Amino acid sequence: LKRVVWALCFMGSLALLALVCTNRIQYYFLYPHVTKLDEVAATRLTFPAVTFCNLNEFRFSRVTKNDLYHAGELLALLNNRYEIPDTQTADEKQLEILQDKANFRNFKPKPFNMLEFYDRAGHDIREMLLSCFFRGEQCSPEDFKVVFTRYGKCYTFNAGQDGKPRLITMKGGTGNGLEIMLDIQQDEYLPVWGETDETSFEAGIKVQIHSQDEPPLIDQLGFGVAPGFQTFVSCQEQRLIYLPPPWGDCKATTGDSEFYDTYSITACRIDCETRYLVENCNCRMVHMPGDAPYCTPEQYKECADPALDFLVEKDNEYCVCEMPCNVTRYGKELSMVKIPSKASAKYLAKKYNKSEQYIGENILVLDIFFEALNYETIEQKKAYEVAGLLGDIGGQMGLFIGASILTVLELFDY
C-alpha cells in the first residue's frame, strides 16, 4: 500500500542519484583547472637582464675598404658593379669619403667574416654609455655583456652569467632599479641609400627585458626608446605556472632541448631558425648558435636574410613551439619627458665635449624599475582532486540510498 508506493519513490530516489553521480564523474574527466593569481609587493626580487642595441648596426668611421668591398652591397652602399649607386642620397662631405674608399683601383680583397665585422664596426658600449647607475651604485661597461643579435653587437646588463651574483630589488620606484644615459651617435650612422635588412630609417635603440636564462629576440619582441627623451619603464614580474597533461599542454622547463640549457619559447624559436638556415643555406647568421659556417655577405643577401624573414613573417607551420611549464613575463608601462631642458642643454654639451644640438639629437636616458606591486604569480590549480570526487559521489551515495562499496560488492556476489 503506502509502504510500497514510496518504494516507487525509491525508484525515483534511485533515478536522481544516477544523474547527479554521473555528473561529478564526467566533470572529473574534463580535468578542470582554476587560477590562483597573486599580485604582491615582493622582496629579494631578482632583477631581469636588460639587452639593448643601437638601431644602426655598423659605425661609419669603422667601415673599411675591405669591409665596403665584401659587404657594401648588403648595406646598399654599392650596386652590383661594385660602385656607388648613381641614385645615392648625396652628401658633399660624406660622398667624398665613401667614393674614396670605394676606390678599389689598387685593391685586392682580403679575408672577411660578418662576426668580426659586427664585433669591430658595431657600436661600442664604452662610448655609448655616458652614465649608468643601479640602485645608487654606478655601473661601467664592465657590467654589460656583449651579445650578438640580428641588430649586431648588442649589450646585456645583468646577464647574470660570469658567476657574477645577480642583482636584487626590494621596493617600487626608480631608485630601486637601473638608469642609464646613452649617446646613440647619429654622427656614426651609416648613410642609407637604399632599403635592406641591415639599414633603418629610425634613430634610437631597441630594448628587451628578459630572464637571465632566456635569450633575447630583440628584433621581434623588443621595445624602442627615442633619443632626446628620458623614458621611464615601470615593470612587474609575472610568473606563470601551468599544469602538465592531462590538465594542460605543458613542456618541462628543464627541457632536453638543444642549443640552450633551459627550455623557453624564445630559445625554441632560435633553435629552429638555426636548423632552418643551416639546412637551407649551408650557413648560420652571426647571432645563431652551433658550429656552422657564418654566412658571407652574399649568403646574407641571397639566402640567409629571406630565409629568416620567411620564418618570422610568413611561416605558419615549420617553427611553432610548445608552452613551457614556467613562463616569466614582464608587464611594463612606458612614459617620457624631454631631454635636455634649455636650462641644462649647455651643461651636457660642455660636459661631453659636444654641440648643444648634438645633445638634443643623440642623448637619451632610460629608467627601468618596478612598481610597488612588483611581483605577480599566475598559477593554474587543479579543481577536482580524486579524493574530492569520492567524497562527493560517496556523500551522494549515502544520501539517496545509504550504500557503500561493501554493500555493493558483497551483495553483488552473495
Map the footprint of Cl ion across residues 315-344, applying CB under 5 A: 319
Alpha-carbon span 351 to 288, nearest angstrom: 39
CB-nearer residue toward its own copies: 303 or 327:
327
Report if residue 191 touches its own copies, rule: CB under 8 A: yes
- Nearest approach in angstroms of CB 107 to its own copies is 25
The interface mask with Cl ion, positions 258-277, x = CB under 5 A, is -----------x--------
Q: How far is the C-alpha of 327 from the C-alpha of 211, rounded, in Å?
A: 10
Q: Determine, following the binding rule CB under 8 A, whether residue 186 of this chain makes contact with its own copies.
A: yes
Which residue in 27, 247, 260, 375 binds its own copies (CB under 8 A)? 27
Q: Does 43 bind its own copies (CB under 8 A)?
A: yes
Q: Which value, to the nearest 10 degrees, does the dihedral of the CA atoms of residues 24, 25, 29, 31 take?
A: 30
**DSSP reduced 3-state for 383:** coil
- CB closer to Cl ion out of 251 and 269: 269
- Indicate the length of the chain as a whole number: 414
Among 55, 167, 209, 304, binds its own copies (CB under 8 A): 55
Of 294-313, binders to Cl ion (CB under 5 A) are 311
Which partner from the list its own copies, Cl ion, none does 14 bind, CB cut-off 5 to 8 Å by kind? none
Q: Which three cell numbers stand for residue 131?
A: 652614465
Q: Which residue, 21 or 272, is less far from Cl ion as judged by CB?
A: 272
Among 174, 212, 262, 280, binds its own copies (CB under 8 A): 174
> Applying CB under 8 A, which part among 45-53, 65-73, 120-128, 373-381 lies near its own copies?
373-381
Judged by CB under 8 A, does residue 405 bind its own copies?
A: yes
118 backbone dihedrals φ, ψ, rounded to 5°: -60, -50
Binding residues among 382-401 for its own copies as defined by CB under 8 A: 385-388, 390-401
User: Parallel, antiparallel, or unpaired for β 363-382 and 229-241?
Assistant: parallel
Q: How far is the CB of 406 from its own copies (least distance, A)?
A: 6
Q: How far is the CB of 110 from its own copies (least distance, A)?
A: 27
Identify which of residues 84 and 170 has a Cβ nearer to its own copies in the complex.
170
Residues 237-276 that bind its own copies (CB under 8 A): 240, 265-266, 269
User: Considering beta carbons, is residue 323 or 383 the nearer one to Cl ion?
Assistant: 323
Q: Is position 90 an interface residue for its own copies (rule: CB under 8 A)? A: yes
Choices 30-38, 106-114, 275-283, 291-299 (CB under 8 A): range interacting with its own copies: 30-38
**What b-and-e string marks burial along 293-324, b requiring 16 or more CB atoms within 10 Å of the CB?**
ebbbbebbbebbbbbbeebeeeeeeebebeeb
Instruction: Judge if the upstream peptide bond of residue 340 is cis by omega within 30 degrees of 0.
Output: yes
Residue 168 backbone phi and psi in degrees, to 5? -120, 170
Rg (C-alpha) for the chain, rounded Å, is 31
Q: Are strands 152-157 and 144-149 parallel, antiparallel or unpaired?
A: antiparallel
Q: How many residues make contact with its own copies (CB under 8 A)?
A: 136
Nearest to 119 by CA among 153, 162, 96: 153
If one asks whether residue 136 binds its own copies (CB under 8 A), the answer comes out as yes
Stretch that binds its own copies, among 65-73, 97-105, 167-175, 274-282 (CB under 8 A): 167-175
Handedness of CA 340, 346, 352, 356 (dihedral sign): positive
Grid cell, residue 23, equals: 555528473
Sign of CA dihedral 115, 119, 123, 128: positive
Contact between 73 and 301 under an 8 Å Cβ cutoff? The reply is: yes
At residue 193's C-alpha, the angle toward residues 188 and 196, to 5°, is 90
Binding at 81: pick from its own copies, Cl ion, none (beta carbon under 5-8 Å per type): none
Q: Which does 221 bind (CB under 5 to 8 A by kind): Cl ion, its own copies, none?
A: its own copies
**How many residues belong to the site for Cl ion (CB under 5 A)?**
3
Stretch that binds its own copies, among 155-163, 254-262, 295-303, 372-380 (CB under 8 A): 372-380
Q: Which is nearer to Cl ion, 319 or 378 (CB)?
A: 319
Least distance in angstroms from the C-beta of 56 to its own copies? 7
Please report, as residue ranges, which positions from 318 to 337 form the binding site for its own copies (by CB under 8 A): 320-321, 323, 327, 329, 332-337
Residue 183 parent element (H or E): strand 173-183
Smallest distance from its own copies to CB 348, Å: 6
Report the first-to-last Cα separation within the chain, whole angstroms: 29
What are 299-305's contacts with CB under 8 Å, separation 24+? 300/74, 300/114, 301/73, 301/74, 301/196, 303/277, 304/277, 305/196, 305/197
State yes or no: residue 56 binds its own copies (CB under 8 A). yes
The contact set with Cl ion (CB under 5 A) reads: 269, 311, 319
